[PDB]
Amino acid sequence: FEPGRTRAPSLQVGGE
Amino acid sequence: FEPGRTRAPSLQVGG
Amino acid sequence: SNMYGFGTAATGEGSGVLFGNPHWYWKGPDRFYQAQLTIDGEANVSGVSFLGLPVIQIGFNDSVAWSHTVSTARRFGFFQLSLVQGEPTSYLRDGVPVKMKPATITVPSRNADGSVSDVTRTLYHSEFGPLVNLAGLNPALAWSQGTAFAIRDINGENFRTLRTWMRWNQAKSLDEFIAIQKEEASIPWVNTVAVGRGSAKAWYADIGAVPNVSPAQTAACTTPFGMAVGQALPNVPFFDGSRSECDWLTDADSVQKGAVGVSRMPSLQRDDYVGNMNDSYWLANVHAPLTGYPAIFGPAGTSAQTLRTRMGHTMALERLAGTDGYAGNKATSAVVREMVLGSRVFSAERFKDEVLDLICTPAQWTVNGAAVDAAQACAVLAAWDNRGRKDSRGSHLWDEFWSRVPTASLFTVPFSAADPLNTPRGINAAAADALRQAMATAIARVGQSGYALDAPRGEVLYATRGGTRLPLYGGCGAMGYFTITCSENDITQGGYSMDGQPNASNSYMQVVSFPASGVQAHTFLTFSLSDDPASPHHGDYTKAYSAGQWLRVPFTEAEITGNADYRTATVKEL
Amino acid sequence: SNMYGFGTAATGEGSGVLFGNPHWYWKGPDRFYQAQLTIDGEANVSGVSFLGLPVIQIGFNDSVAWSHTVSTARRFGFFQLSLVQGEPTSYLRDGVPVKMKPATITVPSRNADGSVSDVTRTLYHSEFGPLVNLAGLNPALAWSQGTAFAIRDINGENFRTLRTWMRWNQAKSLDEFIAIQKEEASIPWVNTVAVGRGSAKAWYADIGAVPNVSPAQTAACTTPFGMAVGQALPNVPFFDGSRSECDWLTDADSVQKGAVGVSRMPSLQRDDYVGNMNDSYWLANVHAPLTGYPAIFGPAGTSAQTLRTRMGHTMALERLAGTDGYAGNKATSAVVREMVLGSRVFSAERFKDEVLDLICTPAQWTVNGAAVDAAQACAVLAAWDNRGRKDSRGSHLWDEFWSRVPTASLFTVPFSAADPLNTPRGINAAAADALRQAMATAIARVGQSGYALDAPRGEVLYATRGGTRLPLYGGCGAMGYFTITCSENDITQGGYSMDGQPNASNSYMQVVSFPASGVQAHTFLTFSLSDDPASPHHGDYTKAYSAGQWLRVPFTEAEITGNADYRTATVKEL
Amino acid sequence: TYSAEIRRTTMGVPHIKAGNWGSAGYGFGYVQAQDNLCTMADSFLTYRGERSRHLGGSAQLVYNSTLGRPRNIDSDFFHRHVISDEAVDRTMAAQPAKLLQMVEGFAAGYNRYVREAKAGGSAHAACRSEAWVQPITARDVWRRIYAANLAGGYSNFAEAIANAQPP
Amino acid sequence: STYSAEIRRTTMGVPHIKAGNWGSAGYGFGYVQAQDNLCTMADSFLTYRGERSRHLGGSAQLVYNSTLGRPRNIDSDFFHRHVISDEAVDRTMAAQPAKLLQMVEGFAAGYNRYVREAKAGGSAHAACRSEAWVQPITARDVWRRIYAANLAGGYSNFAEAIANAQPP
Ligand SMILES: CCCCCCCCCC(=O)O
Ligand SMILES: *C(=O)CCCCCCCCC
Burial C281-296 (b: 16+ CB within 10 A, else e): bbbbbbeeebeebbbb
Write the DSSP symbol of residue D128.
T
Rounded to 5°, the CA angle D198-D200-D204 comes to 110
Residues E37 and E113: their CA atoms lie apart, in Å, by 8
Smallest Cα–Cα separation from E147: which of C128, C50, C100? Answer: C50
DSSP state of C295: G
Beta strands in D409-460 (DSSP E): 411-413, 425-427
- Go through chain C and tell me how many residues it has: 574
Distance D521 CA to ligand 2 centre (A): 19
Q: Is E82 left (phi over 0), alpha (psi -120 to 50) or beta?
A: alpha
- Write the CA distances from C58 to C22, C65, C560, E83, integer angstroms: 9, 8, 20, 25
Instruction: Give F130→chain C minimum CA distance, Å.
Output: 5
Crossing angle for the helix pair F139-150 and F22-49, to the nearest 10 degrees: 70
Q: Give the ligand at the shortest distance from the Cα of D276.
A: 2
Q: Are residues C341 and C442 in the same domain?
A: yes
3-class DSSP assignment, residue D35: strand
Of C190, C486, C503, C506, the residue with max ligand 1 atoms within 8 A of its CB, to mutate for a pocket test, comes to C190
Nearest CA-CA partner of F162 in F97, F94, F89, F68: F68
Reported for C485-488, long-range contacts at CB under 8 A and 24+ positions apart, including other chains, are: C485/C388, C485/C461, C486/C23, C487/C461
Distances (CA, A) of C412 to C428, C430, C435: 6, 10, 15
Secondary structure class of D204 (helix, strand, coil): strand
Strand, coil or helix: D476? coil
Question: Which ligand has the shortest distance to the CA of D69?
Answer: 2
Phi-psi region for residue D558, left (φ > 0), alpha (ψ -120 to 50) or beta?
A: alpha
- Say whether both D101 and D217 belong to one domain: no
Distance from CA of C121 to the nearest CA of B (A): 9
Order of strands, edge to edge, in the sheet holding C267-270?
C267-270, C202-205, C190-196, C64-70, C58-60, C43-50, C32-39, E14-18, E2-8, C567-573
Amino acid at D323: T
Q: Which of D480, D497, D514 is the last residue of a domain?
A: D497
CA distance C123 to C130: 8
Residue D447 domain-assigned?
A: yes
Of the candidates C280, C274, C285, the residue with the CA atom closest to the CA atom of residue C295: C280
Contact of A4 with chain E, judged by CB distance below 8 Å, is answered with no
Is beta strand D76-84 parallel, antiparallel or unpaired with respect to D238-240? parallel
Which residue type, as a one-letter code, is found at position E42?
Answer: D
How far is Cα D501 from Cα D431, in angstroms, rounded to an integer? 35
Range of the domain at D385: 304-497
Q: Domain segments of chain E: what residues?
A: 1-167
Instruction: Please state, in angstroms and as integers, the Cα–Cα distance from residue F132 to each residue in C426, F43, F159, following that order.
Output: 27, 10, 25
| Cβ atoms within 10 Å of C61's Cβ, excluding its own | 24
Mark yes or no for CB contact D232/B9 under 8 Å: yes
Peptide bond into C424 cis (omega under 30): yes
Q: Which amino acid is at E50?
A: E
* Statement to judge: residues D169 and D104 lie in one domain: no
Q: How far apart are CA D90 and CA E150, in angstroms?
A: 47
Chain D residue nearest residue E118, CA to CA: D370
Rounded distance between C-alpha atoms, residue C398 and residue C400, angstroms:
6
Q: Whose CA is nearest to atom 11 of ligand 1?
A: C69
Dist. CA C376–CA D295, nearest whole Å:
65
* Polymer length in residues for chain A: 16
Distance CA(C155)–CA(C148), nearest Å, equals 22
d(Cα C168, Cα C160) in Å, to the nearest integer?
A: 13
- Are C332 and C439 contained in the same domain? yes
Quickly list DSSP for D259-282: B--GGGS-EEEESSEEEESSS-GG
**CB of C1 less than 8 A from some CB of A:** yes
Measured by CA distance, the residue closest to atom 6 of ligand 1 is C68
β-strand pairing of D496-497 with D461-465: parallel
CATH number, domain of C212, equals 3.60.20.10
Please give the CATH architecture assigned to the domain spanning F1-168: Orthogonal Bundle (1.10)
Cβ proximity of D320 and D10 under 8 Å: yes
User: What number of other Cβ atoms are within 10 A of residue E56's Cβ?
Assistant: 18
D574 within a domain of the structure (yes/no): no
Q: Chain C within 8 Å of B5 (Cβ-Cβ)?
A: yes
CA E120 to CA E103: how far, in whole Å? 26
Residues near E145 by Cβ (< 8 Å), separated by ≥ 6?
A: C52, C53, C161, C162, E91, E103
Contact criterion met (CB below 8 Å) for D354 and D34: no
Taking the C-alpha atoms of residue C131 and residue C154, their distance in angstroms, rounded to an integer, is 15
Q: Say yes or no: D398 and D459 in one domain.
A: yes
Query: Whole-angstrom Cα distance, residue C17 to residue C7?
Result: 7
Alpha-carbon distances of C527 from C308, C507, D533, rounded to whole Å:
22, 7, 33
Considering only CA atoms, which of F19, F7, F9 is closest in space to residue F99? F19
Question: How far does Cα C419 stand from its chain's mean position?
Answer: 24
Which segments of C432-556 are extended strands (E)? Answer: 461-465, 468-471, 496-497, 505-506, 508-513, 520-525, 551-552
Distance separating alpha carbons of residues F123 and F121, to the nearest angstrom: 7
Burial category of D164 from C-beta neighbours within 10 Å (exposed 0-12, middle 13-18, buried 19 and up): buried
C483 touches C503 (CB < 8 A): no
Of C123, C153, C183, the domain-final residue: C153
Rounded distance, CA C212 to CA C122, Å?
31
Kindly state if the Cβ of D58 falls inside 6 Å of ligand 2.
yes
> E102 and C54 in contact by Cβ < 8 A?
yes
d(CA C55, CA C84): 46
Q: Are residues C158 and C170 in the same domain?
A: yes
d(CA C16, CA C336): 11
Residue F145's closest CA among F120, F108, F106, F97? F108
Q: Same domain, yes or no, for D384 and D365?
A: yes
Give the span between the Cα atoms of D334 and C451, in whole angstroms.
43
| Residue D321 exposed, middle or buried by CB count within 10 Å (0-12, 13-18, 19+) | exposed
Q: Is D94 exposed, middle or buried (0-12, 13-18, 19+ CB in 10 A)?
A: exposed
Cβ atoms D158, D186 nearer than 8 A: yes
Is-contact E26 E105, C-beta < 8 A? yes
Considering the domain boundaries, does residue D573 fall inside one? no
Does residue C572 sit within a domain? Answer: no
CA C544 vs CA C509, C520, C537, E121, E139: distances in Å: 12, 18, 12, 28, 38
DSSP D49: E
Residues C145 and C236 in one domain: no
Residues C31 and C56 in one domain: yes
DSSP H helix total and E strand total for chain C: 14, 31
Nearest to D311 by CA among D263, D354, D278, D360: D278
Q: What b-and-e string marks burial along D519-529, b requiring 16 or more CB atoms within 10 Å of the CB?
A: bbbbbbbbbbb
Task: Determine the atom of ligand 2 nearest the C-alpha atom of D189.
Answer: 11
| Closest of D330, D341, D325, D338 to residue D16, by C-alpha | D330
C-alpha separations of A15 from C346, D81, D405 in Å: 20, 45, 38
- Whole-number Å distance, alpha carbon D526 to ligand 2 midpoint, is 16
Residue D340 lies in a domain: yes
Question: Any CB–CB contact under 8 A between B8 and chain F?
Answer: no
Question: Is C571 part of a structural domain of the chain?
Answer: no
For residue D79, the cross-strand partners are D150, D239
> Does residue D481 share a domain with residue D448?
yes
Residue that terminates a domain, selected from C125, C153, C181: C153
What was the resolution (in A) of this experimentally determined structure? 2.2
**Considering just the CA atoms, what is the radius of gyration of chain B in Å?**
11
For residues D263 and D214, state if they share a domain. Answer: yes
What Å distances lie between residue D547 and D325, D341, D461, D541, CA to CA? 21, 11, 13, 10
CB-count burial class (<10 Å; 0-12, 13-18, 19+) for D361: exposed
Q: Report strand pairing: C496-497 vs C461-465.
A: parallel
Distance of CA F137 to the CA centre of its chain: 8
CA neighbor of C168 nearest in space, from C262, C81, C68: C68
Domain count, chain D: 3
Ligand closest in space to the Cα of D168: 2
C365: closest chain F residue by CA: F130
Q: How far is Cα C534 from Cα C354, in angstroms, rounded to an integer?
A: 50
Using left for φ > 0, alpha for ψ between -120 and 50, and beta otherwise, residue D377 falls in: alpha
CA F76 to chain centre: 15
Q: What is the CA radius of gyration of chain F?
A: 17
- Residue D561, chain F, CB below 8 Å: the answer is yes
Helix, strand, coil in percent for chain C, rounding step 5: 25, 30, 45
Supply the CATH number for residue C130's domain. 2.30.120.10
Instruction: Please give the Cα distance from C502 to C545 (Å, whole number).
Output: 16
What angle in degrees, to the nearest 10, is found between the helix axes of D432-449 and D395-402?
A: 130
CB atoms within 10 A of CB D141: 22
Backbone angles phi, psi at D166, to 5 degrees: -60, -45
E81 CB-near residues (< 8 Å, 6+ apart): C103, C105, C123, C130, E161, E162
Neighbours of C470 (CB within 10 A): 19
The three-state secondary structure class of D316 is helix
With respect to residue D234, please indicate whether it lies within any of the assigned structural domains: yes
Please report, for residues C37, C55, C552, C564, the alpha-carbon distance to residue E11 in angstroms, rounded to integers and kept in the order given.
Answer: 17, 20, 11, 11
Does D18 map to a domain?
yes
- Identify whether residues C488 and C381 lie together within a single domain: yes
With an 8 Å Cβ cutoff, is C440 touching chain F? yes
Instruction: Show the DSSP H helices in chain E as ranges.
Output: 21-48, 51-55, 72-82, 85-93, 97-119, 138-148, 158-162
| Whether D and E touch (3+ CB pairs < 8 Å), yes or no | yes
Q: What residue of C is the nearest CA neighbor of E54? A: C110
Identify whether the C-beta of residue C139 lies closer than 8 Å to the C-beta of residue A5. yes
Q: What sign results for the dihedral spanned by CA atoms F30, F31, F33, F39?
A: positive
Whether the CB-CB separation of F49 and F80 falls below 8 Å is answered with yes
Could you give phi then psi for residue D9, rounded to 5 degrees? Answer: -55, -40
CATH number attached to the domain at E1-167: 1.10.439.10
Q: Residue F118 in contact with residue C371, Cβ under 8 Å?
A: no
Closest CA to C279 of C313, C228, C253: C313
Protein residue closest via CA to atom 2 of ligand 1: E148
Nearest CB to A12 within list C70, C139, C236: C70
Contacts of D63 (CB under 8 A, 6+ apart): D171, D172, D173, D174, D196, D197, D514, D519
Beta bridge partners of D393: D456
Q: How far apart are the first and last CA of chain B?
A: 28
Sheet bearing C496-497, strands edge to edge: C468-471, C461-465, C496-497
User: How far apart, in Å, are the Cα atoms of D528 and each of D506, D535, D566?
Assistant: 12, 10, 18
User: For chain D, how big is the Rg over CA atoms in Å?
Assistant: 26
> Residue D476 in contact with residue D486, Cβ under 8 Å?
yes
The count of residues in chain D is 574
The whole-angstrom separation of Cα C527 and Cα C538 is 8
The CB-side HSE value for C266 (13 A sphere, CA atoms) comes to: 30
The dihedral built from the CA positions of residue D205, D207, D211 and D216, taken in this order, carries a sign that is positive
